[PDB]
Design an enzyme around this catalytic site. Structure first.
Site, PDB file in Angstrom:
ATOM      1  CG  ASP B   8       7.440 -20.330  21.668  1.00 22.06           C
ATOM      2  OD1 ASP B   8       6.563 -21.007  21.084  1.00 22.06           O
ATOM      3  OD2 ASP B   8       7.312 -19.945  22.864  1.00 22.06           O
ATOM      4  CG  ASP B  10       2.149 -17.470  24.447  1.00 21.22           C
ATOM      5  OD1 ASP B  10       1.394 -16.510  24.215  1.00 21.22           O
ATOM      6  OD2 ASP B  10       2.363 -17.915  25.605  1.00 21.22           O
ATOM      7  CB  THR B 122       3.581 -21.873  17.623  1.00 22.17           C
ATOM      8  OG1 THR B 122       2.468 -21.630  18.505  1.00 22.17           O
ATOM      9  CG2 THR B 122       3.105 -21.976  16.161  1.00 22.17           C
ATOM     10  CG  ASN B 123       3.094 -26.637  21.702  1.00 24.05           C
ATOM     11  OD1 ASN B 123       3.536 -27.127  20.675  1.00 24.05           O
ATOM     12  ND2 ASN B 123       3.547 -26.969  22.903  1.00 24.05           N
ATOM     13  CG  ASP B 184       7.962 -18.707  26.372  1.00 20.80           C
ATOM     14  OD1 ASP B 184       7.770 -19.431  25.358  1.00 20.80           O
ATOM     15  OD2 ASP B 184       7.033 -18.368  27.134  1.00 20.80           O
ATOM     16  CG  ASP B 334       5.552  12.567 -11.515  1.00 23.35           C
ATOM     17  OD1 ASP B 334       5.317  12.097 -12.673  1.00 23.35           O
ATOM     18  OD2 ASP B 334       6.339  13.500 -11.290  1.00 23.35           O
ATOM     19  CE1 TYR B 382       9.591  16.894 -16.875  1.00 20.59           C
ATOM     20  CE2 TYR B 382      10.431  18.864 -15.784  1.00 20.59           C
ATOM     21  CZ  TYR B 382       9.512  17.836 -15.869  1.00 20.59           C
ATOM     22  OH  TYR B 382       8.511  17.747 -14.936  1.00 20.59           O
ATOM     23  CE1 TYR B 465       5.947  15.555 -18.026  1.00 21.48           C
ATOM     24  CE2 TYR B 465       6.093  13.259 -18.702  1.00 21.48           C
ATOM     25  CZ  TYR B 465       6.365  14.263 -17.802  1.00 21.48           C
ATOM     26  OH  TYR B 465       7.076  13.961 -16.669  1.00 21.48           O
ATOM     27  CG  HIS B 523      10.469  13.533  -8.289  1.00 22.70           C
ATOM     28  ND1 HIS B 523       9.345  14.326  -8.415  1.00 22.70           N
ATOM     29  CD2 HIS B 523      10.279  12.461  -9.094  1.00 22.70           C
ATOM     30  CE1 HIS B 523       8.532  13.774  -9.295  1.00 22.70           C
ATOM     31  NE2 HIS B 523       9.071  12.638  -9.713  1.00 22.70           N
TER      32      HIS B 523
HETATM   33  O1  LIG Z   1       7.249  15.327 -14.858  1.00 19.90           O
HETATM   34  C1  LIG Z   1       7.210  15.220 -13.644  1.00 19.90           C
HETATM   35  C2  LIG Z   1       8.248  14.421 -12.901  1.00 19.90           C
HETATM   36  C3  LIG Z   1       9.607  14.471 -13.579  1.00 19.90           C
HETATM   37  C4  LIG Z   1      10.717  14.668 -12.569  1.00 19.90           C
HETATM   38  C5  LIG Z   1      11.762  13.618 -12.867  1.00 19.90           C
HETATM   39  C6  LIG Z   1      11.346  12.911 -14.130  1.00 19.90           C
HETATM   40  C7  LIG Z   1       9.886  13.195 -14.335  1.00 19.90           C
HETATM   41  N1  LIG Z   1       6.247  15.787 -12.829  1.00 19.90           N
HETATM   42  C8  LIG Z   1       5.062  16.285 -13.387  1.00 19.90           C
HETATM   43  N2  LIG Z   1       4.895  16.913 -14.535  1.00 19.90           N
HETATM   44  C9  LIG Z   1       3.578  17.250 -14.722  1.00 19.90           C
HETATM   45  C10 LIG Z   1       2.729  16.880 -13.707  1.00 19.90           C
HETATM   46  S1  LIG Z   1       3.616  16.080 -12.476  1.00 19.90           S
HETATM   47 MG   LIG Z   2       5.930 -20.128  24.648  1.00 18.53          MG
END
Ligand SMILES: O=C(CC1CCCC1)Nc1nccs1
Ligand SMILES: [Mg+2]
Ligand SMILES: O=C(CC1CCCC1)Nc1nccs1
Ligand SMILES: [Mg+2]
Lengths: 546, 546
Positions: B8, B10, B122-123, B184, B334, B382, B465, B523
């Site tokens: 229901d 209400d 429902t009504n 109800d 990010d 990285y 990047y 992250h």
């Molecule tokens: O590269 C990342 C995130 C990584 C962490 C895990 C994989 C990617 N951040 C940034 N780099 C540059 C600006 S924001």
């Molecule tokens: Mg009711």
């Protein structure tokens, strides 16, 4: 010989100029003549104002610096500044006082349309005031009409520095003497002239336009009223929603604010609203212009009942649901008009307001089969033609160009009656192979519709006419109700099918009904009288939909 | 044995029930006990209220009829009605007083998730009050969580009439004794029980839930806190904008109100915001969740410079321009975080407000080449791995499932360090072929990302990047500025790459910076702590973005 046009902003595309408020403020507060200008210009090329125009600092960073300059200028000229003197307040009022100079904008438009490359070249700032949106909006409204907008603070250069003109000439891909540049400050013209540009010192708009008329050899002043801005399909945000497994709705979306949903007729397209879409965005709305079920890039399932009003409505509701809209304003025309009325009747909680172009709200006759009802009015004979799946499709799909060029005509331009269509055996039996292009549409505009209907043809659109019985039964469930939500009806004097008098008793069912009338306007309301249409809808939205 | 659940509205999904305001109003105005109920029910099956619940009349049509009934009821019980007694006012307050009963909604959710067919029966009425939107919104919020919503006034039938249960059983595609129906009002249960349905008289929510727990054999009461609502890609409004001839941006769009634009990181998707999208729609916003350039259904041109920050930003501006938005709130994470800061810096007129998850605003070092700067921090090794076009692509595109299952992990679940990645010769050199599924994501969720990256792979994302030098040069043009628009920074305690202390000096450049912190959060902020994230963003939008 001339191929490009450049327009200053402040004092050319937008009036009054802000140095104009500089001077008024002085008199207003009885300060030394030009004191505010000295402060503004203090230190020339290394001064606060240049650093700002160049993008080194933001507007809010500059405000206190200008305060200092006014303190120093006032101290040197031996006068006091007033109690509560405020640079922010002066400049707010100023910036928000400036409006588009319609005649200039329109002149630029004209030149663009006759082939010129158009640009805005302006000294301007990175605006970070709380009230920055005002200017953002102006800059939006303006930029869409020009090939380029070059801003001092975006490129790191200013008028009159000669480098910005080199950058200018380069962006335009033109040589010094194919360019006309109009500006209100003589100094800014100086280097344009040195490179060999035609220049125009803009004082009163009309003389500037006369010089620009004389120099380009194109009429700009006293030209007829121009059409509202249109839409280039490929510059639009296009949206897609699956309302159910086989069926997706496509729409085009512009602007922000209350959601207004535009529902076209037979046999049309979201494109049928090209003159409304910018106008309403501009007027503060979120326009969602549909391709209705069966058309364009929306799905076109073959079954007839996929097109009865009930299913069509349920589907518009799901459209709101998945897009996350609790309401929208529904504006429809022709078949879209029938649908918005049914939306007000079966889903008023979801309709902020409803409006129809041409299509009256006539309640079903519970004592008369709707097929019988339609034989009662000779003007409706073509609907019977449409009943037999396949017949109308073959005529309509046979020549697409022919079809729209035949339908899309102004009242005085007609090439087809909807009279004895069954008898005659067709809609175009007594109309040309290659019709002349109506004054309402360009060749390109006809091709757009042509390319749309190439996707699904006319089965789906025609099906909208193939549920007379089902729709009648459904409508009858609503005979007890009234429409009490805000509602506008707009009649078209010269619609020979959906005639204004068909709407006469609508107040019995819609007691607060608001009305608009358009003289000299055929059945294709939006493209026939775009200016009058926008004026009526924008006024009504503003009072009834906010 | 049980396969469907019916709730229901209400008094079951929404509290307090409106007959509850009927009774309070009586005491409040010291009227005869139950007088308002008699009036409400007057004439039973042929009375004003039934005709309303059945859809014969709209709410606004019913209001005066109820007035009459109260006049007649008061006359027969020999009492006067108060000065300025008003049915509209009572019912407005009532309708807008009702709120979703969270525990019940959540119980229905649970049952749905363990396979039950769920419905609201429902009504209810066709609401055409000026204030109808309130209820529309409720009905939206609720309906999205159920397989069906059957409304008395939509189907022409009411509780307790036995026909509505037949319609019910039929919509559910179930037999009387696979259904549990909670309501109800005892009378409404009566016919459910006759057909053999398990029923539950709902008084206090918790006992109802106990009975429903006992009868379905599924824990509903005292269950852990559930995740925020997610998005099914195929139920979303998907949008597309060409920002320039080769390049289109795809986005997903939900809700209405101020425009909030969501900018995901590397290597992600609009989908990375699945837990934010409903929450913000719900909170009164127009969420536009991007697929950023290079990802998903957005274009992925191969050239590196198509991905420098400047071009990326110019392109987000064009996105606003063509969609007709003068501003939007920009929220990024990010890489999307880097971008929104640059948007605040180079286009503040277009940014209503800015917020970043994890990504600090650190101004460029004008005396140190950014490649040199990045060798200074081992945690960033990285990024160097990513420089050489092709290397990272081959590792990442080799097993897509492997990749996301490896990256998308909570802090305590890690299977990869970003440490000496160059040395090691790869991101996954020392991590499994088939990683275990993290507790943050389902198998299906991983496949979504997998199917996205199948479109363009990693060239485009990786290119983000590959403009360290170009971006540095550009950033340096902004060293003079400050961010003075509203700005929120949100740090994640356990982000080992974008660590909270990197944000420490941000107030030097962003003086009014507002902060949020999330403990125990890796992250992948949005999917790791969706509830905390929504709470922080919705609170900040409400104070700084309206
Ligand atoms: O590269 C990342 C995130 C990584 C962490 C895990 C994989 C990617 N951040 C940034 N780099 C540059 C600006 S924001
Ligand atoms: Mg009711
Ligand atoms: O069929 C039309 C428009 C026609 C006039 C010119 C071609 C189509 N109107 C409507 N019928 C039913 C509801 S609205
Ligand atoms: Mg000027």
């Amino acid at each position: 010989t001339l191929r490009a046009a450049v327009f200053d902003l402040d004092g050319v595309l937008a009036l009054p100029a802000v140095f104009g408020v500089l001077g008024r403020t002085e008199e207003a507060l009885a300060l030394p003549r030009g004191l505010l200008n000295d402060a503004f210009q203090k230190g020339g090329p290394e001064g606060a104002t240049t650093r700002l125009m160049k993008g080194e600092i933001t507007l809010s960073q500059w405000i206190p610096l200008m305060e200092e300059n006014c303190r120093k200028c006032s101290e040197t000229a031996k006068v006091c500044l007033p109690k509560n003197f405020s640079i922010k307040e002066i400049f707010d009022k100023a910036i928000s006082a400036r409006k588009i100079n319609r005649p200039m904008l329109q002149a630029a438009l004209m030149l663009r349309k006759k082939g010129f490359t158009t640009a805005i070249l302006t000294n301007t700032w990175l605006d970070d005031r709380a009230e920055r949106d005002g200017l953002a909006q102006l800059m939006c409204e303006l930029k869409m009409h020009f090939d380029f907008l070059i801003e001092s603070c975006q490129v790191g250069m200013v008028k009159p520095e000669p480098q910005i003109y080199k950058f200018l000439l380069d962006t335009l891909k033109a040589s010094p003497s194919e360019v006309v540049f109009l500006d209100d400050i003589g100094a800014n013209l100086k280097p344009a002239r040195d490179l060999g540009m035609v220049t125009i010192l803009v004082q009163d708009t009309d003389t500037a336009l006369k010089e620009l008329e004389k120099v380009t050899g194109i009429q700009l002043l006293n030209t007829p009223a121009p059409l509202p801005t249109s839409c280039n399909p490929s510059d639009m945000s296009h949206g897609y929603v699956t309302v159910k497994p086989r069926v997706r709705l496509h729409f085009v979306e512009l602007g922000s604010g209350p959601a207004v949903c535009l529902c076209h007729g037979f046999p049309e397209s979201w494109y049928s609203w090209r003159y409304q879409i910018p106008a309403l965005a501009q007027a503060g709305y979120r326009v969602l212009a549909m391709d209705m079920k069966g058309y364009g890039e929306s799905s076109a399932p073959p079954e007839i009942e996929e097109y009865c009003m009930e299913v069509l409505c349920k589907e518009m509701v799901t459209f709101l649901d998945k897009l996350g809209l609790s309401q929208a304003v529904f504006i429809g025309h022709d078949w879209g008009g029938m649908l918005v009325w049914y939306m007000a009747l079966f889903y008023p909680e979801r309709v902020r307001a409803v409006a129809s172009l041409n299509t009256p709200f006539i309640p079903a006759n519970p004592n008369m089969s709707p097929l019988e009802s339609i034989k009662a009015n000779p003007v409706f004979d073509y609907q019977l033609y449409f009943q037999e799946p396949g017949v109308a499709e073959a005529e309509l799909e046979q020549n697409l160009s022919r079809t729209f060029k035949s339908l899309f005509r102004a009242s005085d331009e007609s090439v087809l009656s909807m009279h004895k269509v069954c008898e005659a055996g067709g809609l175009f039996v007594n109309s040309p192979e290659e019709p002349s292009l109506s004054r309402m549409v360009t060749e390109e505009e006809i091709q757009f519709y042509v390319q749309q209907f190439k996707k699904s043809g006319f089965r789906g659109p025609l099906n909208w006419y193939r549920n007379m019985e089902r729709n009648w039964k459904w409508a009858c469930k609503s005979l007890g109700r009234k429409i009490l939500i805000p509602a506008l009806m707009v009649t078209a004097e010269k619609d020979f099918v959906l005639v204004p008098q068909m709407s006469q008793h609508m107040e019995d069912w819609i007691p607060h009904l608001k009305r608009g009338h358009i003289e000299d306007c055929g059945h294709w309301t939006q493209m026939d009288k775009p200016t009058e249409v926008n004026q009526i809808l924008i006024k009504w939205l503003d009072s009834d939909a906010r």
